[PDB]
Write an enzyme that holds these catalytic residues in place. Sequence first.
Site, PDB file in Angstrom:
ATOM      1  N   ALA A  65      37.789  29.314  49.372  1.00 53.29           N
ATOM      2  CA  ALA A  65      38.400  29.741  48.120  1.00 53.29           C
ATOM      3  C   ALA A  65      38.046  28.839  46.946  1.00 53.29           C
ATOM      4  O   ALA A  65      38.254  29.242  45.797  1.00 53.29           O
ATOM      5  CB  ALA A  65      39.919  29.811  48.272  1.00 53.29           C
ATOM      6  N   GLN A  66      37.519  27.641  47.198  1.00 61.76           N
ATOM      7  CA  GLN A  66      37.171  26.729  46.115  1.00 61.76           C
ATOM      8  C   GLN A  66      35.756  26.954  45.596  1.00 61.76           C
ATOM      9  O   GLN A  66      35.508  26.798  44.396  1.00 61.76           O
ATOM     10  CB  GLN A  66      37.342  25.277  46.576  1.00 61.76           C
ATOM     11  CG  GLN A  66      36.665  24.945  47.899  1.00 61.76           C
ATOM     12  CD  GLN A  66      35.291  24.332  47.712  1.00 61.76           C
ATOM     13  OE1 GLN A  66      35.018  23.689  46.699  1.00 61.76           O
ATOM     14  NE2 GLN A  66      34.416  24.533  48.691  1.00 61.76           N
TER      15      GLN A  66
ATOM     16  N   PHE B 104      33.881  31.826  54.012  1.00 66.21           N
ATOM     17  CA  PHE B 104      34.296  32.018  52.627  1.00 66.21           C
ATOM     18  C   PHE B 104      35.369  30.989  52.289  1.00 66.21           C
ATOM     19  O   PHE B 104      36.498  31.070  52.784  1.00 66.21           O
ATOM     20  CB  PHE B 104      34.813  33.437  52.402  1.00 66.21           C
ATOM     21  CG  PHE B 104      35.616  33.595  51.142  1.00 66.21           C
ATOM     22  CD1 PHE B 104      35.016  33.445  49.901  1.00 66.21           C
ATOM     23  CD2 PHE B 104      36.970  33.884  51.198  1.00 66.21           C
ATOM     24  CE1 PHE B 104      35.752  33.585  48.740  1.00 66.21           C
ATOM     25  CE2 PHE B 104      37.711  34.026  50.039  1.00 66.21           C
ATOM     26  CZ  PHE B 104      37.102  33.874  48.810  1.00 66.21           C
TER      27      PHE B 104
ATOM     28  N   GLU C 168      36.714  43.019  52.195  1.00 65.97           N
ATOM     29  CA  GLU C 168      35.627  43.382  51.291  1.00 65.97           C
ATOM     30  C   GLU C 168      34.310  43.552  52.045  1.00 65.97           C
ATOM     31  O   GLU C 168      33.523  44.455  51.728  1.00 65.97           O
ATOM     32  CB  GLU C 168      35.530  42.340  50.166  1.00 65.97           C
ATOM     33  CG  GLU C 168      35.055  40.952  50.589  1.00 65.97           C
ATOM     34  CD  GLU C 168      36.183  40.077  51.113  1.00 65.97           C
ATOM     35  OE1 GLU C 168      37.269  40.607  51.427  1.00 65.97           O
ATOM     36  OE2 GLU C 168      35.965  38.862  51.279  1.00 65.97           O
TER      37      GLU C 168
ATOM     38  N   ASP D  33      50.354  34.868  42.897  1.00 63.93           N
ATOM     39  CA  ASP D  33      48.955  35.083  43.300  1.00 63.93           C
ATOM     40  C   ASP D  33      48.676  36.553  43.013  1.00 63.93           C
ATOM     41  O   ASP D  33      49.635  37.306  42.790  1.00 63.93           O
ATOM     42  CB  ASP D  33      48.775  34.761  44.776  1.00 63.93           C
ATOM     43  CG  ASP D  33      47.886  33.587  45.039  1.00 63.93           C
ATOM     44  OD1 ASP D  33      46.826  33.947  45.757  1.00 63.93           O
ATOM     45  OD2 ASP D  33      48.110  32.477  44.669  1.00 63.93           O
TER      46      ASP D  33
HETATM   47  N1  LIG Z   1      34.090  37.318  51.707  1.00 64.30           N
HETATM   48  C1  LIG Z   1      33.609  36.919  50.505  1.00 64.30           C
HETATM   49  N2  LIG Z   1      32.316  36.557  50.353  1.00 64.30           N
HETATM   50  C2  LIG Z   1      31.832  36.159  49.163  1.00 64.30           C
HETATM   51  N3  LIG Z   1      32.571  36.088  48.042  1.00 64.30           N
HETATM   52  C3  LIG Z   1      33.880  36.423  48.047  1.00 64.30           C
HETATM   53  C4  LIG Z   1      34.483  36.864  49.310  1.00 64.30           C
HETATM   54  N4  LIG Z   1      35.774  37.125  49.043  1.00 64.30           N
HETATM   55  C5  LIG Z   1      35.981  36.881  47.730  1.00 64.30           C
HETATM   56  N5  LIG Z   1      34.855  36.455  47.139  1.00 64.30           N
HETATM   57  C6  LIG Z   1      34.758  36.102  45.707  1.00 64.30           C
HETATM   58  O1  LIG Z   1      35.671  35.031  45.473  1.00 64.30           O
HETATM   59  C7  LIG Z   1      36.730  35.423  44.598  1.00 64.30           C
HETATM   60  C8  LIG Z   1      38.059  35.275  45.328  1.00 64.30           C
HETATM   61  O2  LIG Z   1      38.925  34.418  44.588  1.00 64.30           O
HETATM   62  P1  LIG Z   1      40.460  34.188  45.019  1.00 64.30           P
HETATM   63  O3  LIG Z   1      41.275  35.395  44.620  1.00 64.30           O
HETATM   64  O4  LIG Z   1      40.872  32.826  44.519  1.00 64.30           O
HETATM   65  O5  LIG Z   1      40.406  34.115  46.627  1.00 64.30           O
HETATM   66  P2  LIG Z   1      41.110  35.229  47.558  1.00 64.30           P
HETATM   67  O6  LIG Z   1      40.491  36.541  47.141  1.00 64.30           O
HETATM   68  O7  LIG Z   1      40.756  34.798  48.961  1.00 64.30           O
HETATM   69  O8  LIG Z   1      42.577  35.098  47.227  1.00 64.30           O
HETATM   70  C9  LIG Z   1      36.469  36.857  44.167  1.00 64.30           C
HETATM   71  O9  LIG Z   1      36.237  36.903  42.757  1.00 64.30           O
HETATM   72  C10 LIG Z   1      35.228  37.306  44.909  1.00 64.30           C
HETATM   73  O10 LIG Z   1      34.227  37.722  43.977  1.00 64.30           O
HETATM   74 MG   LIG Z   2      43.576  32.730  48.906  1.00 67.62          MG
END
Ligand SMILES: Nc1ncnc2c1ncn2[C@@H]1O[C@H](COP(=O)(O)OP(=O)(O)O)[C@@H](O)[C@H]1O
Ligand SMILES: [Mg+2]
Lengths: 190, 27, 676, 557
Positions: free
Chosen positions: C373-374, C371, C342, C301
């Site tokens: 992840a999908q 939020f 963030e 990851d």
């Molecule tokens: N709190 C949030 N609110 C809105 N969009 C988000 C948030 N956190 C991440 N994102 C968007 O979603 C994506 C995250 O993808 P991913 O890496 O698969 O999930 P994570 O960051 O939880 O591991 C990022 O590209 C970002 O632009």
């Molecule tokens: Mg994740």
Amino acid sequence: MSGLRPALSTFIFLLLITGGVYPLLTTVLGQWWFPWQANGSLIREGDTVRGSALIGQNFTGNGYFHGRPSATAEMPYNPQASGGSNLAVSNPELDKLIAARVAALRAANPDASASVPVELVTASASGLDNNITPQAAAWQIPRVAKARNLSVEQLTQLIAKYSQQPLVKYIGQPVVNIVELNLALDKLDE
Amino acid sequence: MSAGVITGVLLVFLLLGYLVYALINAE
Amino acid sequence: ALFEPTLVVQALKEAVKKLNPQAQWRNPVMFIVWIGSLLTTCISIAMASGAMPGNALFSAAISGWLWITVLFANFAEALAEGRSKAQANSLKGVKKTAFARKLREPKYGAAADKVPADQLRKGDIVLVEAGDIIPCDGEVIEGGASVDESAITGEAAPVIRESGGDFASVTGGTRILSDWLVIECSVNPGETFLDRMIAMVEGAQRRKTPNEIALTILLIALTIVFLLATATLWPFSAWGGNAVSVTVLVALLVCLIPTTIGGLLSAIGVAGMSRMLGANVIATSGRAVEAAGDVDVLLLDKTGTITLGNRQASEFIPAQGVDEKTLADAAQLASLADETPEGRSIVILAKQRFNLRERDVQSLHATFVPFTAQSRMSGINIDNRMIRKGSVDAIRRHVEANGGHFPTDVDQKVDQVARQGATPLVVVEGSRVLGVIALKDIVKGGIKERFAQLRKMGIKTVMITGDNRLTAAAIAAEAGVDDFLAEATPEAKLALIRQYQAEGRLVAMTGDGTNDAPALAQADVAVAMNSGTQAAKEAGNMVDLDSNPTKLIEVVHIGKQMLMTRGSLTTFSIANDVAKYFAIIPAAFAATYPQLNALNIMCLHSPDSAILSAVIFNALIIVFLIPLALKGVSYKPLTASAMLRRNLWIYGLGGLLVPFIGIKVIDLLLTVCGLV
Amino acid sequence: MAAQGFLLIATFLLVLMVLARPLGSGLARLINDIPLPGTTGVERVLFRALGVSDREMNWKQYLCAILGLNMLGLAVLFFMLLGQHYLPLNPQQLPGLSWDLALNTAVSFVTNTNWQSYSGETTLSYFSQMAGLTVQNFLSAASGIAVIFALIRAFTRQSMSTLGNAWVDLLRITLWVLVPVALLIALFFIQQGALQNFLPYQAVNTVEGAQQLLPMGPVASQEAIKMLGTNGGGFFNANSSHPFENPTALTNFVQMLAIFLIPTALCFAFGEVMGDRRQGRMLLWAMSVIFVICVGVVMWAEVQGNPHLLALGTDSSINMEGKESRFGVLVSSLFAVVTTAASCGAVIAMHDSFTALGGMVPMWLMQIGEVVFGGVGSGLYGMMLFVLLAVFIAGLMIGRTPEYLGKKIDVREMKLTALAILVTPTLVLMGAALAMMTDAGRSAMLNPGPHGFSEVLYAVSSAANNNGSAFAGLSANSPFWNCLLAFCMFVGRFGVIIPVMAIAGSLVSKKSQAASSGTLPTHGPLFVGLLIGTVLLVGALTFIPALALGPVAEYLS
Ligand SMILES: Nc1ncnc2c1ncn2[C@@H]1O[C@H](COP(=O)(O)OP(=O)(O)O)[C@@H](O)[C@H]1O
Ligand SMILES: [Mg+2]
Ligand SMILES: [K+]
Ligand SMILES: [K+]
Ligand SMILES: [K+]
Ligand SMILES: [K+]
Ligand SMILES: [K+]
């Protein structure tokens, strides 16, 4: 599945073929092409047969060319029970047999080298052997030359004429057919 | 052929059976 | 770890002989030598009693040397078990103080009362202040402070464990430094991973790896070969003359059978588990560890595993048709109530850049969109018209639902931000878009060198990221990995693990999130991150403690060292037997076969000295290969054929020449000491 | 002499690979269920007549089919040999056999061992030596080729839990591989001077005048399959030493080629079926290195010979005792190693009059499990068992999972491979122990001293390893010896057959893995040396005690 019928059918067919076609076809082809070789390579002189050209015989008398000793059952050179001495190199019985054979050959051949060839004193594997090396034949010249009044050179040419050499010098050994050589020697001398 | 011989043969057969059983059931 | 403390060796020396009375039923190779030892002892007693005439001192010495060979094998097993027990005692912890504060209201509603932690059931919330050890595993729902993971991990370093996001896990036994925390009892005590690893090594529940069962079968087969040869050797010499005694046959059988590997295999397994735990990575089953040697792909990851997490923004960017306060007012309330890193970063940067003192958390209420992840979407709607935020694909597909046309200059801006190396974040003004928020992520150090070492060893590291296509390229250029899978839904990794498994390859990965839990549960070699949820902790067959994304190189070091050491000891014990023959076979037949003395290529003194020296070397090679079994043989990343050649040259011809020198030295020592 | 022997080895191996290259593609076509370039509807009408189809059955039914065919054949042989005088074509009017001799010979000819406890020309009739001998030689060779075909199909088939059909395998093998090549070989034997007729025993008066009875009968048809299928046992007692069986050196060379034709063609078929020929040539290198070493050692021992002969007034110290004279000592040594390594019972020399070391090496090749160009399929699946041991050890050394040709080797494969490894030496050692503990077992002895135990151990090793060649000094015609040998041969062959079929059925359930970087290369000199060392050490650590009490004791005496 149970499958008793295909097993039996396979066994009957593969018995019928390999016991009534292939041996019969081999026998028919052999008798139709190469009958003298396929029937035993017998030397036929008259109504009786003197012997085969491969299986060999026994020549006790000093006039004929002696071959390798035989370890067959009952009489020597008996084809009803083939086989060798089956005596190991660490066997005193083999030691006495070797010593007796060397003594007998040295008594029979006084006008020759004391280094008796290994073939004339060692028993053959089958016990039915019709082959010796021409070196042993040259060693056995003087006994025949003393027994019958012929030439050493004449015997040498006769043995070289009756020397079956292999196709390659080292795939086998140069040998002479003893039974045919003795029969031809008798026929040419008388 | 004797008592000690048959005892040794029986012990060898017991060890062989135990080892075969362990080979089948090493688990 | 200390290899041999004298105190623990003399403590476990009693446990060495505690496993002697018929506890070797599960070890057939050493049950054979125990049966031979008992038979030799009984025939020596009956031989000194008057019956069966002969030199009973030689049989007594043979019986004693087989007995101490059994003692040496049990000493190897007990030393490995004692090392594992000492490691378990070191990883016991501090949590015996069960002073836990039972909390009633699921907030900071006081409620500080001393209760025992043995009645802590699933669904009970515990709050404790700084300076006190936390009782159990904690999933903080609100709060965040600095903890000390020294007593659990192994090193003391200031680490901050906030709530809300992925880095919201604390393990019991860690002291707290600055502020109070919230402990959520997700698992009952006695069922956590720490309790499992400290309780499995206590009991003798050693579920053997299938490679270990297969090699046990092969060693049993070798024992059958040598037992039949020894047993049928008696009638041959009996026909040949005076038959050989029982004790010389038992000595030849013991010198023949694979005693070395057959007694050091369990020590290899237990010491390998101890060395596995010594790298701060825990394996609950060696069946995955033995298959971890045959891996080729690693899935990683990025957000929270390779990087440090805690994505902090650096600079906002405007667009052609928008001002800066219009960015700031939407940014401060886009994730105002979210505990996301963030969101807190954009809030603190907006307040530092403009100091817009708007509503603290909400006006009266809001939507508080989580939020996922999908879908990668979040938003708050109270007074505007459905303003949101998300990743580039989610914002674009929301524009197709709301505005349709998308700004290509902003697309060029997010492309150049991705090339710069910041994870994109775009918010919604309600109908159109305003621009991206650059999040300059920070990456862990040394991963480039460790991935270069992995490429040298031959594991194809694959990045798994659902952020953006160019961000994966920017994060791969400075890390040195193979081709990635960017802009991917978290179900793509679930499809990809089965895709690589169905191809015959064995797939291995790492992760920490709750969404990653099916992938952790379905992957073959799936280590669990220390800063990860309890669902991932229980789904992964292994768990890490150093918070490193590339501990799989140490995992495959341990697994390959296990297999290498076990096979090397097997081949050494095979190669010993030709010198065992050259020592015993000329010695065993002297009166009955006087011509067999020409096979003494070592020129030994007497046949009894030769047999005794062979048995002494059979014991001494085991006690000298105890440290090799404890440490594990040397492993270097090379070609498989070259490694096979090196192992052959060390434990083949080398393990064939060692018994000759050992037997000669022991016979010379016996001759100069004058016993025989 | 040494140059002549090396030239013999070189030209024999060269013409062997020359004749085995076209047979490899044909045998691969037979493995891959592909019909021959001929077969214009004859296979369809034959299978319609015989009631078999192009089915696809599993390992249990394949093993049951092979075992049922062999058991039916064994019962037919036993009843035919018991009631020999009822059946026609008996010109010598030889009576029915004893129950023990008939059972031993029936098990001998069905279980591919072909131990002969008798003298053929005064023991069995012409129809007996046809139907109960040549037919079962064909069937046993076809059973071995069918079993190794099923093993290769198991290795090459992925996620296919069925292993072809034993009926079509046996039919195609028997009537397209064994029969026509045997026809050509028998016609060449007839050309060179073999025997094939049905005349009675021709009375012959010698040149001196002594009586001599020459046996007759279908010898060449026996000899052809006897050398093609590695099925020992001659028409007469002197197995391939009788000039009616081996007239010329060309016949002997063709016999060597027929013995080594099928294992080499099976290795080539493995290489062609598995795509890359490196895996089919690694096996051939592993056979050839050990074969050349053993042949050279036996030639050197026989050339040095017996010093007692040179001490007793003989110019030649070469041990030509119990050897043919048309066949050289080097040729006899090579043929002895060939038959003792390839499970052929032919004996150019009586194997008993050899030197102690020159009988030690071929009996060791007998006792290592018959892998070095061994048997007819029976050597190649034993070599496969040794390859599974080698790849398990190599995977242990490299730290990877033990795999061979993309198939992961599992606990069931290790169990059955260990059992198949242990079946032969437990029978050799237990039979030798049972023979040396009984006066009936030791009363068949001929040579006093440790060579007698060498004879007994060679007999039991040739029995349980399914070879059939004998020192022939053992009087194995006793009922105890006959029953012991028959039991050893039967349970040895079929208790190696059953776990091999079980390994095949365990491997059809698995799926192949694609070869990637960092895998173990299963070819080259390193793996060849590892496999050769594995075979040598497994065959040595089992049998160095027995060899040391036998021929090594005789040599050092
Ligand atoms: N709190 C949030 N609110 C809105 N969009 C988000 C948030 N956190 C991440 N994102 C968007 O979603 C994506 C995250 O993808 P991913 O890496 O698969 O999930 P994570 O960051 O939880 O591991 C990022 O590209 C970002 O632009
Ligand atoms: Mg994740
Ligand atoms: K073995
Ligand atoms: K075998
Ligand atoms: K076999
Ligand atoms: K035979
Ligand atoms: K063996």
